[PDB]
Design a protein around this ligand. Sequence first.
Ligand SMILES: O[C@H](c1cc(C(F)(F)F)nc2c(C(F)(F)F)cccc12)[C@@H]1CCCCN1
Length: 1192
Amino acid sequence: STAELFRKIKNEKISFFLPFKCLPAQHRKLLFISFVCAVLSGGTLPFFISVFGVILKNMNLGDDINPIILSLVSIGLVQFILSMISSYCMDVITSKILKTLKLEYLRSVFYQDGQFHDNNPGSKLRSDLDFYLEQVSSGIGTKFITIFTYASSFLGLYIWSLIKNARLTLCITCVFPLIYVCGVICNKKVKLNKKTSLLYNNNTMSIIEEALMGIRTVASYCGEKTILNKFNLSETFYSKYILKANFVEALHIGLINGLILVSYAFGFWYGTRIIINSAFNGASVISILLGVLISMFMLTIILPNITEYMKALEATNSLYEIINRKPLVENNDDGETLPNIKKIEFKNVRFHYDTRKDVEIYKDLSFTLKEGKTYAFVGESGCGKSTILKLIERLYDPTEGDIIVNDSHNLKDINLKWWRSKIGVVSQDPLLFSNSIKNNIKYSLYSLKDLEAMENYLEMKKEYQTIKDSDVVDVSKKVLIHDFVSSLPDKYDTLVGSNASKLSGGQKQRISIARAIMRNPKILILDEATSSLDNKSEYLVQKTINNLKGNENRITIIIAHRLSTIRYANTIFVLSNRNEGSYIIEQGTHDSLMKNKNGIYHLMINNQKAPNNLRIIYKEIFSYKKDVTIIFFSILVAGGLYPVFALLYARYVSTLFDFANLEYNSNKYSIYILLIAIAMFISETLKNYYNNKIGEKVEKTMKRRLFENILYQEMSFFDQDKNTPGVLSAHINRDVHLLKTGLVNNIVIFSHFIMLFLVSMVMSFYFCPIVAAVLTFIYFINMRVFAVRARLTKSKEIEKKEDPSFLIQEAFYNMHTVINYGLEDYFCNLIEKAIDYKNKGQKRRIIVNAALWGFSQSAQLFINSFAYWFGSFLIKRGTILVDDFMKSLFTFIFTGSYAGKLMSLKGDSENAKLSFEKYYPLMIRKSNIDVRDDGGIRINKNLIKGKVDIKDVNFRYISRPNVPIYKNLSFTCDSKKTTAIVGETGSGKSTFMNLLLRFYDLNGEILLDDINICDYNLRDLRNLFSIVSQEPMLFNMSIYENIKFGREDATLEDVKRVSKFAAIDEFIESLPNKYDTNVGPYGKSLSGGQKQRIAIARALLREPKILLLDEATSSLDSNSEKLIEKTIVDIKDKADKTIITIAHRIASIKRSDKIVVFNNPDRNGTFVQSHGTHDELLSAQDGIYKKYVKLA
Ligand SMILES: O[C@H](c1cc(C(F)(F)F)nc2c(C(F)(F)F)cccc12)[C@@H]1CCCCN1
């Protein structure tokens, strides 16, 4: 509501002048012109309406109308022109301020403190800005000035009507407060139910996602239906509450079209009463009612524009605070500068992350750096040398340390600009621009050449070309890139690729090295200079760096990661942190640091050295007969009895200028209006409600089919990539709500529209055929051939989608490269390439789009005037009477207006019809693995031993049909004896389980009691197993139901019993709602041990004839570990249970009766190698069991 935001803004006092401040003084009054070019056009209707009654008095009495027509059309023309001016003004102003705020935002982005660069990652900002623009590019345009026109019209109409007659309109305007009251009272009761409706939807969302993620656990226990039931029981409440909301939503709508007619009737009635009591004519009564009515219409169209304007205001306040965010590390020029940089001293460098405020990395980084020295440094792959170079560059500052230089001055006194100026940097990867080869090289010295002109006298702009192509030649010859660049065509012309994508990487690193060399730093630094080079080119680069022109004044720090290239070094401060801070463990030269001791550096140098589909829907819709016929009848009644108002209004005008027999006529004609209103109420009520009552059922019978078919689909369908839970949950919600909102909201509208367009047109021919043909021709050539709004919105939206669309995107991925140089060189390379291409097309676009809007506001006036002229023309020569014309006219006009009114309620029809074909196969797609298909032998769960056998297997996934996984497996497990499996970790041990449970089918042969697997009625085959994953999963149901998952019929006492083996049934008796406390989503409200014990209890409740473990106690404490192992051995002691395990401790393997082993000689599969160690013969020959006892 507007009052909400008004009370909000009342206290902070945002300036309503705020968007209009990035403007010169010239645009202060080009704006002001449009103030007066949009108040005059509000004083138009008070003239038309004030002559409206006089025209009718003048036509049905004999006299002529010609002066008033010419008095009117001139005002129409000046309205056209005054409407044409304002568009051209306002759009230009908006484009200007829109450009300028963007160009301020880019600058403010380039002045973040380094920490903020890490806080908000990159392209998010690029995705934010544009969004805010489309909240303000189309929210302060012409639809701001449309306020004042309507306000002026309101004031003029009401006050003129009041001075002409006051008691009448006072007696009329006493019904509209009751509309506002009903509106708020209905809005309350709508929100109160809508929020509960929303509340009962996220539950279903969770039930879908959490169930699709952990899919195979559902298939193993066969717990499909106990999710469907919860889904339906949560869906029904949503349906009923949203229908209760739609009822009140439709009642108010159907009501507002009922009181306006009472207003008309009482108005005319009291008018005739005062006319009779007079002894003020009748021409002064037709206008008062229309004035008071269209006056209070403008208060329904002003407010959305105010909302959008406040929205633009808050959007701009959400951006100027970004532009007014100050960094801590400023690139000012207030800092001083030494003659040259001497003796950069470090001492106790301390710093923590501003995000994580309890983690330190450095303690005592401290050493000296003075000109004329050579060095060599190396760090581990987790040091944070990035932090070191960032602090050299001053992206951050320490917390306790110091950057003392020359033992007299800290870095804070030194100019950051001068500091980065005299530092050549090279980084890890070649992520460079796409301008050209040389332009990455000659633009560097700008960072210094600005100083030639900034402190001297803009001469900076002209000295760009002054740096010629001289140094590229020699700096290319040095790094040996001269050979290649002089070989391929377009030597210094073929640009470095799009975001550095065309040429080789190491050669782009040579370009970076040339940048560092050419910019003439007093301190030339390199970091990861030679990270991934070959031998000879690296050595030549080394020879280039250590012996540049005049190496007596420089500090040639180098950080390589190959240890055969740290040969020369005045000192090698290699460090370690073994964790609250590093410290330099190693100190010395290359020769006196490897042979020093058997230390860390010693180890380092040692190691390296079609239409059917939709008539499905229509078939579904053509079965609920009790709700189709009612909608049909309401459509008939509305379409039939709205036009009757027109020719009941005409007869009431023609009978007004007859002083005789007036009382009876009034008493007879007002009552029909009353009755028609009482019918229209009920019609619009029962029309806008069963629409949604039919919309609901199609959704909640399609969602059922989808979510019921998806569960039974085989596992290979889920193994694919596109079959992701996110997209599959996105479909079921979005496209189904579109099938509701899109389709049935565009089958009723067409029917009602066609009903009106037939009945009104036909019984408009019958009274005056000569006028109707003209009118239809006019509106035909106007709408379907000169669609002003269509062409306007098209020409808008095409060019509103939008080389400023190319440089901006690639200028953020290289945000670390722009800091090497280039801060304003691309502040002033986008202004040009914007302004050059805006205006040249903008002129034509805006002049056309302003003329087309100025035409649209003053078209009905000319048509109406022409109609009145053509009507009073024929009547003079005695061809048609007056009443027939009035009847043929009012019906057409009012019905056209109403038909255009309700037409603007459609929804998205095409995209829903499109998506229905996307997801139609899924509710019908064949899976060829169905738990329901029960053709096969039943597994009676009493005659079972558990003898598994493997004849031969050669299996491979379809995800890659190139990697063999099994090379002729063969082993057995006889009866009620453990068979442990010890092998290489990651060799694919936990895959045979999936084969056994028919998650995949067969290039291999598995037997159960010497019987094939495909003849078992697999529901029962999954009824006598129980697995244990690495981590179980706990759904959002109760602990009672989590344990009872799979088997619905079970007592709480049995749960208390089987919960004893897991030894967890004491913690549960430590809090209220013991077997009722609902765990959180994904089991995030409990521990890991509790989770596994609950999973074990769930597996044991079923009385599983065969057990299948996997990674028993990978992370549990010894207590729960030995309790579990106690359960294992105790349950092995009894018969009637064959167990198979995959352990990682001899503590359990000692009880193994046969220990089968898998090996991986070469990466092409596995096969059995060992059998029968049974803890006695650990290695009579070679094996891995010896390894897994001597390591254990
Ligand atoms: O049919 C009515 C209508 C009124 C007026 C008014 F009298 F205010 F100048 N002008 C309309 C115009 C006009 F072009 F502005 F004259 C076009 C279509 C409908 C108009 C309104 C339009 C908005 C939806 C309700 N009917």
